[PDB]
Design a protein around this ligand. Sequence first.
Ligand SMILES: COc1ccccc1-c1nnco1
Length: 185
Amino acid sequence: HHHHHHMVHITLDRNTANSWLIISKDRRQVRMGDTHQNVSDNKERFSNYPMVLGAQRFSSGKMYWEVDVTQKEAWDLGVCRDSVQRKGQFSLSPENGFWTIWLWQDSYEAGTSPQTTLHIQVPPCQIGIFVDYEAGVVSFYNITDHGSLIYTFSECVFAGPLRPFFNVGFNYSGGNAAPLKLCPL
Ligand SMILES: COc1ccccc1-c1nnco1
């Protein structure tokens, strides 16, 4: 892929974060805390899951960014509509405004409804995410494996501004404490 030149500088939006997340000073890393992080509640925070949005909103053009997932056991990554539900239980699906992939229990799946099995021979340590707003495409790339394609959502119906989407996952096992990190350009 030659998507690298559409690179965008993504930063995390503290105000959207689940109250247990710890976002770094530079707003480029996020991890699960072992407790509530002493913030006030607001209508933007994801209540049920360890999720956070990027600050950037996209309504046109081509955008690319990379995320480091080294040594995590569980995470979700992609892009979502600015108006996705924040409170209560929901599934990650295009019907609910999400275009995502995940790792869970040693398998990778795309957030279609129902979910789609991914075929990854080289477990990724960094994921590339490409959005073509006009074409209705969201693609995922395995940076560890020379940028090989992981998955393409096509015929996307965004139906609003898009935001970068992140889930660091729970840490019930004690093996999923590592952060998500936005990689430098
Ligand atoms: C089955 O997909 C959808 C259902 C509902 C709304 C959007 C989609 C979609 N987006 N990109 C591809 O599909």
